[PDB]
Amino acid sequence: AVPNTPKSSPDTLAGNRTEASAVSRPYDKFNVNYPLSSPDQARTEVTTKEIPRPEDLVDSPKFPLFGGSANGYMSKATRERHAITWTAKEETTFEMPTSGWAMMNKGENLCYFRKKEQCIALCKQLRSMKINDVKIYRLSKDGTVTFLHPSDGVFPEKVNKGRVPVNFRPFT
Amino acid sequence: DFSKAAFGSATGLVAKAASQTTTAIWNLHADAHDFSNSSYLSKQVFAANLAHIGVVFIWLSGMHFHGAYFSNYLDWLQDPSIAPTAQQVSNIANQSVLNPIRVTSGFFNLWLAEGITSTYQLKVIAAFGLIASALCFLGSYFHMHSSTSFTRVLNTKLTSLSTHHLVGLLGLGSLAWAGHLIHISLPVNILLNAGVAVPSPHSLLSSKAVATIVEQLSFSALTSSDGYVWQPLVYSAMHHFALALVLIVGSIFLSTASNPLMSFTVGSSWHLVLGVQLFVTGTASVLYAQMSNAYPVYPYLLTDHPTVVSLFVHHMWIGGFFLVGAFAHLSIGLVRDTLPQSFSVVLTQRDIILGHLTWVVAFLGVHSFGLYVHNDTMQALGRPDDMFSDNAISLLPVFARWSTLTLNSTGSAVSVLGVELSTADFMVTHIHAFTIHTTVLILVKGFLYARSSRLVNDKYKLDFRYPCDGPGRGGTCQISPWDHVFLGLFWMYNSISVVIFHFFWEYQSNLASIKASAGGSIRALASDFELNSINTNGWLRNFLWSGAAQVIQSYGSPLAAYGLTFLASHFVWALSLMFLFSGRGYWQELIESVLWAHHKLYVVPHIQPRALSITSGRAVGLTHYLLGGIGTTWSFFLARIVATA
Amino acid sequence: REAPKVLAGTGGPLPESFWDPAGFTNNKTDEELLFYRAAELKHGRIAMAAVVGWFTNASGFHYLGDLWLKKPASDNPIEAFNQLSLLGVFQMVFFIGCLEWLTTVPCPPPKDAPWDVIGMSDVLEEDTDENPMAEYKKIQMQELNNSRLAMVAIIGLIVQATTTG
Amino acid sequence: VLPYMENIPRAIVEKEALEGVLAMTPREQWEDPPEDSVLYTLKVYAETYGEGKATKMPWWDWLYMRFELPDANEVSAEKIKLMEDDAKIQRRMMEGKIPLYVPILGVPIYTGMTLDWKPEAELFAGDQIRSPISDSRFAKNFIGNTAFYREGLENWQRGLEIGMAHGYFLVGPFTTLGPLRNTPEAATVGLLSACAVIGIVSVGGLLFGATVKPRAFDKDGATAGSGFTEIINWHAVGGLGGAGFCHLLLTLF
Amino acid sequence: DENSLYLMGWFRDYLWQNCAALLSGYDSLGSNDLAVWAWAFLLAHLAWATGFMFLISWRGYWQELIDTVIYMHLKAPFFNEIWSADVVTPVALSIVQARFIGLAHYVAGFILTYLAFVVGATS
Numbered sequence A: 001a002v003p004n005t006p007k008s009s010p011d012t013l014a015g016n017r018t019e020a021s022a023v024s025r026p027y028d029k030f031n032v033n034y035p036l037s038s039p040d041q042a043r044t045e046v047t048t049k050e051i052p053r054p055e056d057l058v059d060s061p062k063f064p065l066f067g068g069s070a071n072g073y074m075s076k077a078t079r080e081r082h083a084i085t086w087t088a089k090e091e092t093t094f095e096m097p098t099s100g101w102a103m104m105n106k107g108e109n110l111c112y113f114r115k116k117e118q119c120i121a122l123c124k125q126l127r128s129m130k131i132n133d134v135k136i137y138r139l140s141k142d143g144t145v146t147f148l149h150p151s152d153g154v155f156p157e158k159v160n161k162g163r164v165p166v167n168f169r170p171f172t
Numbered sequence B: 001d002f003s004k005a006a007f008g009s010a011t012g013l014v015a016k017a018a019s020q021t022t023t024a025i026w027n028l029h030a031d032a033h034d035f036s037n038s039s040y041l042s043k044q045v046f047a048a049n050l051a052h053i054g055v056v057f058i059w060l061s062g063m064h065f066h067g068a069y070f071s072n073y074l075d076w077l078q079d080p081s082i083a084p085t086a087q088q089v090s091n092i093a094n095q096s097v098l099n100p101i102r103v104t105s106g107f108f109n110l111w112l113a114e115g116i117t118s119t120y121q122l123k124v125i126a127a128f129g130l131i132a133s134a135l136c137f138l139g140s141y142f143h144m145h146s147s148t149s150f151t152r153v154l155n156t157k158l159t160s161l162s163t164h165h166l167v168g169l170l171g172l173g174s175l176a177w178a179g180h181l182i183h184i185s186l187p188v189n190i191l192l193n194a195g196v197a198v199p200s201p202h203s204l205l206s207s208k209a210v211a212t213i214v215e216q217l218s219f220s221a222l223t224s225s226d227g228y229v230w231q232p233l234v235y236s237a238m239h240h241f242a243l244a245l246v247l248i249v250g251s252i253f254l255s256t257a258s259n260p261l262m263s264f265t266v267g268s269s270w271h272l273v274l275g276v277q278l279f280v281t282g283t284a285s286v287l288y289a290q291m292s293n294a295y296p297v298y299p300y301l302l303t304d305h306p307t308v309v310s311l312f313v314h315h316m317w318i319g320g321f322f323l324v325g326a327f328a329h330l331s332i333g334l335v336r337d338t339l340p341q342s343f344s345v346v347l348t349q350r351d352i353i354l355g356h357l358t359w360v361v362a363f364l365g366v367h368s369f370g371l372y373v374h375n376d377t378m379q380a381l382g383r384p385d386d387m388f389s390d391n392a393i394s395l396l397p398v399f400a401r402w403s404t405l406t407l408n409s410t411g412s413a414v415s416v417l418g419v420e421l422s423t424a425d426f427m428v429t430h431i432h433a434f435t436i437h438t439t440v441l442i443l444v445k446g447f448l449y450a451r452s453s454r455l456v457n458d459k460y461k462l463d464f465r466y467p468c469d470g471p472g473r474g475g476t477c478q479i480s481p482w483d484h485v486f487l488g489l490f491w492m493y494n495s496i497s498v499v500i501f502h503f504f505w506e507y508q509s510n511l512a513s514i515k516a517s518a519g520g521s522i523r524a525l526a527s528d529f530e531l532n533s534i535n536t537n538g539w540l541r542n543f544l545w546s547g548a549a550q551v552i553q554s555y556g557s558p559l560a561a562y563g564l565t566f567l568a569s570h571f572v573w574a575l576s577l578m579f580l581f582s583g584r585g586y587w588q589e590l591i592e593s594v595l596w597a598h599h600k601l602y603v604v605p606h607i608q609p610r611a612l613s614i615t616s617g618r619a620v621g622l623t624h625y626l627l628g629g630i631g632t633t634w635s636f637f638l639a640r641i642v643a644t645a
Numbered sequence C: 001r002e003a004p005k006v007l008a009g010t011g012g013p014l015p016e017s018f019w020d021p022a023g024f025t026n027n028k029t030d031e032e033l034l035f036y037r038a039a040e041l042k043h044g045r046i047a048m049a050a051v052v053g054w055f056t057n058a059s060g061f062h063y064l065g066d067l068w069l070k071k072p073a074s075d076n077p078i079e080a081f082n083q084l085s086l087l088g089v090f091q092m093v094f095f096i097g098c099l100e101w102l103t104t105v106p107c108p109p110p111k112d113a114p115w116d117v118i119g120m121s122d123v124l125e126e127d128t129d130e131n132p133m134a135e136y137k138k139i140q141m142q143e144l145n146n147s148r149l150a151m152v153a154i155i156g157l158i159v160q161a162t163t164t165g
Numbered sequence D: 001v002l003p004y005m006e007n008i009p010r011a012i013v014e015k016e017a018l019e020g021v022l023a024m025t026p027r028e029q030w031e032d033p034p035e036d037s038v039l040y041t042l043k044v045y046a047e048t049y050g051e052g053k054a055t056k057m058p059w060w061d062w063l064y065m066r067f068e069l070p071d072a073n074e075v076s077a078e079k080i081k082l083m084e085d086d087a088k089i090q091r092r093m094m095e096g097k098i099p100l101y102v103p104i105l106g107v108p109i110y111t112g113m114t115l116d117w118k119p120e121a122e123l124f125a126g127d128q129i130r131s132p133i134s135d136s137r138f139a140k141n142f143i144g145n146t147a148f149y150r151e152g153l154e155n156w157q158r159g160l161e162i163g164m165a166h167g168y169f170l171v172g173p174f175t176t177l178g179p180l181r182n183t184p185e186a187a188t189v190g191l192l193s194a195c196a197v198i199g200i201v202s203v204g205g206l207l208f209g210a211t212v213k214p215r216a217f218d219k220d221g222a223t224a225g226s227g228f229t230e231i232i233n234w235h236a237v238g239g240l241g242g243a244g245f246c247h248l249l250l251t252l253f
Numbered sequence E: 001d002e003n004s005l006y007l008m009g010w011f012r013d014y015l016w017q018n019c020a021a022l023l024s025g026y027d028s029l030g031s032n033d034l035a036v037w038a039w040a041f042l043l044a045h046l047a048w049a050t051g052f053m054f055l056i057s058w059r060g061y062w063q064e065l066i067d068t069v070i071y072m073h074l075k076a077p078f079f080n081e082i083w084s085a086d087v088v089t090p091v092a093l094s095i096v097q098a099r100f101i102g103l104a105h106y107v108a109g110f111i112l113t114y115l116a117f118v119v120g121a122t123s
Ligand code: CLA
Pocket: B029, B030, B031, B032, B033, B034, B035, B274, B278, B321, B322, B323, B324, B325, B326, B328, B332, B464, B465, B482, B485, B486, B489, B623, B627
């Protein structure tokens, strides 16, 4: 719909969001190994086939029982998306990070959010409800998927091998 | 045992080293009535309510005691035009100037409406009020310590509670008051207005008095019963009888089988009930404030102008405070509930509702204050014909000037209440609407963005009252529902201050206009409000600066107390500015230096001095701001309306 | 004789009370019967609004015309309309013409429901048995019954006036 | 059922009341109800009273029990369980289709229609929600047929139409409600002011096209913001035209 | 020498007394040469209270409100095609910026109020 959402594609409305962020904010860049801490840290790779962009999913079976809300991300106004892929043991209710309530599926579940903070809040809520394997992904403008949160497979609360200290200052 | 547990909070405070700080004391005060969720929460709430009822009974007993002993109530009965004073002031220091304090609470008019003619009756009422307070304290004790859990009253026994309140409390109280009116408040006022002496009130319940002296049931009695001070009591008695009948009939003719609190926890249910109750009480207070001067109901009430002004302003302030507290407790109930799925439609239309209200507030503010600033600019530029006034571009409130309808045996209130409105009324009413909308915007935003928001996505994990989430995301200060209530209290203060300013200026303008003389019948505009309340300069000159002469020239007069409270209110209001503008960290470092000074002299307090927390500092600043502003308006209004009326 | 199934139990003394006592339904295609329902609903909505306008004009709530005439307008809605300047009457005609144009050229109504000029059938689901609060057919019948009643009520008002005063 | 909910005397609780309490309480909640639940107090009174247990109780304790326990009708009536089941089915459905209330006199009044609030394309999109004001066919074909969106219109046509509308509107609030209201040249001054406002907003639109370059109207190839800039230029032209037409209709007639 | 001992003197005889002519800069009767200074008096009070706004209310509230306003803009017709909030994103003033701007309004109203009062009193 044209009054509900702008008629132009998100890329058309974005204009030159890239090549201007590199100019407006030349400091805003990710390090060579963003989700991880060391170059030799496996760096599991996922593609759009595994976690597709939300505009390519309509009535997906992995979506939870969500009725839609005005508090979701800005389609056609933002292109970055964060996705959560967690597997349930039973169908129960949970709070969406954007307010409102959704009901989890019996098996696989998949949600899309704009900010990573919403995904991390949902992960905290789910882990408080005894849920493992909560994987958080990031969707870029061109569809490249970056795997986040349990980046090396082990949650950051638990120390794991192969994790080089970062921003560690050897004094008080 | 119980005495040991009375200071149990202090014992717990000193038990752990983490609670050996002044911040622990301030938390102990802030979390005093915040009854935590437990098996005895409902007992605690009900007992606290009964204790408050006992406190109010103590207050009523004290007021009747002052009326009995420290008031010129009998002299006021002999001459209602005299100043009602009910607070003697002893000769200590040098305060003897204000020894008779003109009380403006309307207790004299109330007691006259109750048929009270002797100070012995006031003594009896004070004694029975003390007895009732003692009974309420006994009942509150009992319920807190030995009674039912009361946990079923809001979910299970809500039908019984609502039906009892509908029939017994409300209807039977209205019926009993109608009986009291008809039997002792009408006859006593008849015998006082006629000046034929008043017998004992019980002698009116004899079936041989005027009840059977004449059986005529209309406006005809001994000699000539033409007292118009008496008719409002007749109308009140008829209203109470009709209200009792309709309440009793409709209570049994109502479903009442719909409790929306099934999905809420007991604590959240209590908070939501408190919020809706506060909304109802606040709107009732505002309605009574309007109706007090809209309709005469107490004997010799309209004549006593300070009483009318005080009743209006006090009830407007109480209504505004309770309306804000309504949204405060709605936010508390929403954020403290585990599964508050009931507000799903509004939490999913969060941004839609908030943004439409934002546009409404922006539109109203720009339009109303732009009318005011445009009038200011045009009058400054010497362009009175370009202003917004009756002699210029006229913003006549047409929707106000129509209430005509088919009669069907009606009268009086079938019109605009016999008052014509002008451009000034239109503009000030739109200012009122805008300020109310902004207060509602802040409160509704606090309610909606209570569990989550686009900025912080786990605000429900932060509970109701938190200072911030941090300086991140650009800064997240004042996101809590508590902080939204904190800002909404300022905007309620602004709204109610403008409302009472409008009422006070209109009241003084009407008093001056009716003081035409008798021959002067072209009031033109005159109507100082209608002619000058169109500019901000008009207000600042002809209302604030003009009426401040009474309160600032009160030294050496009985209103010197009002002058001193005016000054103290300004002082407290600037101290509020101190608390609101500053921050916790600086004061913490200052206290660190002061505490070093203490340690240098072996003083070393162990309750470690900590400055007020961020939320505590905001609350102290808001309390001082409200106190200072409301006290300034209180002193100003009372001095102006007592000296000049 | 039963309903033509394109109307399908949508009126009468009861909802399934196909009432036509004139043969205005037989041998008529579904488009024509949909047109009949659209005309009935438009006439209704216009009436239902006109009755409220009449009773709010005959009750003294006649601003915007109190100001235009610069004097209190007549309570009688026919005389009140006659008091209006031809500029105002033709402005009303032009606005209704613009509204009718809107619902034909740029915003044509749904083919299967020409009465749905707002296109409400694109956001509402239906009345279903899983819905405990399903009342869409009930509110459709409320609209139709109040439409049919106000269609004769407004004529009663108009012909009662201008012939009795 | 559970052993303690068997042969409970009517004095403690009615049979219908017990059935209603069980109906409104989750099945897993039994055998260990929470302290604040009705079922917990009903259980506590179920023991120590009935069959071989204590058959009598003091009057004060009887009053306590009566206050703390339901009384079947109007509290645990079958209609109340029906309403609770309806409410839970409603909340299940709103995760999906939402019933439509409208706030009338400040209180939400149910209409009878149920919306499709769930977005058509992206479930978690915050701006793809469906409302009759923004998703009904009238809205789609009204905003879609406006000059800014109407199919078959060149950029200059959109600009000209929007400008004509804006210019004809803007002459209004200036001829009357202005400094030179009661003057013979009120219409001319209003026309000049409307043309000035059209020019200022057109300069603003040119500024937007030069800075943001919206690119939503550009044809193939071309340059970023060419379509929007053409729209704004023809909006200026149409604004002048519509303002002149309004001034003409004011001077005449 | 007598009324400066007590602060009600500082109000009545200084501020309330010396504002009599300034407020009459413009009224229903007309406007004189002090009209500009009464207008500046009001303007300075307005600036001072806007500083009150920036000092009392802090960021988070305003950031959420601005987020909702951005939602209204992005959902508004005829403008989502043109403004995607990517260019000069509207965010609430930072805490330091807000404190400075509130202080600036406070002192601007301070200076202009006292200048207008001095002119209206010593004219
Ligand atoms: C029926 C009325 C009512 C009731 C029963 C409650 C009950 C409650 N409120 Mg509440 N509230 C109300 C009205 C009410 N409120 C209104 C009208 C407002 C808007 C102003 C609020 C705003 C509000 C906020 C913002 C908060 C509460 C909170 C609370 C809870 C804890 C209260 C506490 O510990 O305070 C203890 C008692 C005090 C702090 C009293 C101290 C004195 C106050 C601050 C100033 C009084 C100054 C005085 C009038 C002037 C002095 C005289 C002068 C001459 C010197 C409790 C459930 C808190 C909570 O967490 O809830 C869960 C909370 O954060 N309320």
